[PDB]
């Protein structure tokens, strides 16, 4: 338990099958970095003591994580990055639950540390291939939805008239008919006295099919399957299957990885798409000195399985916070991601053909952010509009139509070689001339 | 305050909420296809085959989830491997519409790196189709 010569092994060669971790580490004053890195490697069975009391175990001779590198953090005075290698034999094949138990189960309480943040993980190809992963992934999703060469467009339903299931479905219909690909159950809408789940599912299925008959395009609504119990959760997933509807939704951090992986496998087995909402992520991922950075939680989700993932907004963020967001968007979507510290990517990640996950971005209040979103995310993203469609003065359907026109004109202008950073306002104003819905949204 | 019409107002995915792309607008999209190394291809359908439908689901048990008929259209000739000049696509668009005047025609693009369809937008709506609105759709 934290001997520093056993666990801090700076000449260790990293194996290909190892799981690597990068911990941003804040030692208690007077505690040297090599002792802290070793303690995190060891996960000592005393978290209060910070000393080797009971030393010599077969859980700690060959099944030990080793701290193979400690680096200073530039500009900080008491923070270090500790790199820990874990042998692949430590981990249950295909169990995100068990990997977090092994890596983050205990060390965040260790008294020798003042603060500890898990920045990144290297998931080796040998571990990656044990997971079912996302039910479809971005490509399959585009083929199944028949939708190519632009972002997908969503909006959250917050009805003006009631939270009843029938009014919920009316609003879904109005948004979808106007041009949106998807609408979205709010993450807390599971099954309440004001709106029981099965009533919600039925009225949303009528709305989806009505807007689909009307538009001739494939339509969905993310039907929240999050439940108190796995059996209730699967009751809802089964209902969606039987309605023949395209997509369901899960809040993977509050339901849990065990339930999320069960659901992702059900969705692979029955061709449902799985939208993933990230409620409570800021409990864990917000503070710079403590917790687990979202890129790790996104990587976990890609392993556990989800076809879309809420990935934040880039509205109101500086270029440096935007570099970070684009880093984890590449970890979500791409097959091979290279080490890139300035984007916060600490490890080369090889997804080994595991399908990518579509990021879902909060678009802003209005449609003038559309050029920035298209330039930053590119086509493989859902842009969610929280009140673009509904702050529109003419209502949900022209608001949807205004968002769809703006996305399509920005897409057209991007393909024509125009610089959306410079000319995006000129692209929108030019589409306002022929689109009365977009012209009324820009009056706002 | 205007009302988005539900009548005869069918959409055909990417770019269908814009005015119909002129020849210059199609040529500029083909330039985007060619610069990326993508493979253009044309596809067409008659109006009754143009938009998503559920009629095959009569044969099914409970597996209709994300199944829909008429996503596939019919290929016009072959994917234009080695297409570098946009005037070939524009000539092929004219030839398809001449052979099939009652057909919608879409231009698709394939990326042989990622081995997947990567674009698809409409280049021709048939006059005789009443299913769609001439951008006075309100």
């Amino acid at each position: 338990k934290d001997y520093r010569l056993t666990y801090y092994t700076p000449d260790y060669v990293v194996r290909d099958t190892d799981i690597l971790a990068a911990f941003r580490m804040t030692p208690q004053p007077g505690v040297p970095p090599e002792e802290c890195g070793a303690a995190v490697a060891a996960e000592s069975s005393t978290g209060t003591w910070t000393t080797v009391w009971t030393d010599g175990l077969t859980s700690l001779d060959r099944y030990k994580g080793r701290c193979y590198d400690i680096e200073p953090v530039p500009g900080e005075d008491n923070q270090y990055i500790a790199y820990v290698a874990y042998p692949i034999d430590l981990f249950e094949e295909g169990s995100v639950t068990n990997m977090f138990t092994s890596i983050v189960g205990n060390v965040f309480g260790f008294k020798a540390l003042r603060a500890l943040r898990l920045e990144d993980l290297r998931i080796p190809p040998a571990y990656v291939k044990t997971f079912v992963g996302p039910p479809h992934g971005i490509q399959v999703e585009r083929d199944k939805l028949n939708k190519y060469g632009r972002g997908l467009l969503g909006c959250t339903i917050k009805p003006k008239l009631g939270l009843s299931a029938k009014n919920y479905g009316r609003a879904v219909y109005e948004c979808l008919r106007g041009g949106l690909d998807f609408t979205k159950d709010d993450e807390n809408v599971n099954s309440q006295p004001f709106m029981r789940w099965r009533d919600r599912f039925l009225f949303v299925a009528e709305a989806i099919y009505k807007a689909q008959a009307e538009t001739g395009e494939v339509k969905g609504h993310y039907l929240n399957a999050t439940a108190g119990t796995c059996e209730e959760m699967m009751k809802r997933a089964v209902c969606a299957k039987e309605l023949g509807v395209p997509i369901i939704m899960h809040d993977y951090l509050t339901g849990g990885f065990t339930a999320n992986t069960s659901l992702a496998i059900y969705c692979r087995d029955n061709g449902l798409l799985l939208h993933i909402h990230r409620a409570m992520h800021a409990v864990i991922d917000r503070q710079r000195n403590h917790g687990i950075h979202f890129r790790v939680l996104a990587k976990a989700l890609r392993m556990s399985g989800g076809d879309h993932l809420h990935s934040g907004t880039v509205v109101g963020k500086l270029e440096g916070e935007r570099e970070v967001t684009l880093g984890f968007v590449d970890l979500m979507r791409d097959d091979y991601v290279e080490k890139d510290r300035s984007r916060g990517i600490y490890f080369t990640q090889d997804w080994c053909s595991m399908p990518g996950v579509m990021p879902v971005a909060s678009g802003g209040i209005h449609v003038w952010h559309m050029p920035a979103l298209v330039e930053i995310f590119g086509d493989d993203a859902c842009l969610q509009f929280g009140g673009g469609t509904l702050g529109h003065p003419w209502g949900n359907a022209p608001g949807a139509a205004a968002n769809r026109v703006a996305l399509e004109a920005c897409t057209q202008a991007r393909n024509e070689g125009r610089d959306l950073a410079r000319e995006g306002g000129d692209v929108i104003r030019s589409a306002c001339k022929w689109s009365p819905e977009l012209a009324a949204a820009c009056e706002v | 305050m205007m009302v988005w019409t539900p009548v005869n107002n069918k959409m055909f995915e990417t770019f269908s909420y814009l005015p119909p792309l002129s020849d210059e607008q199609i040529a500029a999209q083909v330039d985007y296809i060619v610069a990326n190394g993508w493979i253009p291809c044309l596809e067409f359908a008659e109006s009754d085959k143009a938009y998503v439908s559920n009629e095959s689901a009569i044969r099914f048990g409970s597996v209709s989830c994300l199944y829909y008929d008429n996503r596939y259209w019919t290929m016009w000739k072959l994917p234009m491997f080695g297409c570098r000049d946009p005037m070939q696509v524009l000539r092929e668009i004219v030839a398809c519409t001449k052979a099939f005047p009652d057909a919608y025609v879409r231009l698709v693009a394939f990326d042989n790196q990622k081995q997947v369809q990567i674009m698809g937008f409409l280049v021709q709506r048939p006059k005789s189709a009443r299913d769609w609105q001439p951008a006075n759709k309100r």
């Binding site: 393909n415 | 020849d23 500029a28 000049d85 005037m87 000539r91």
Partner: peptide, 22 residues
């Protein structure tokens, strides 16, 4: 994604497409 460099259409391209349509 690469920057789409524009292609000038051949002279009287308009005259070429018009003939074909007929």
């Amino acid at each position: 994604r690469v920057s789409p460099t524009r292609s000038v259409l051949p002279a009287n391209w308009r005259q070429e497409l018009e003939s074909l349509r007929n």
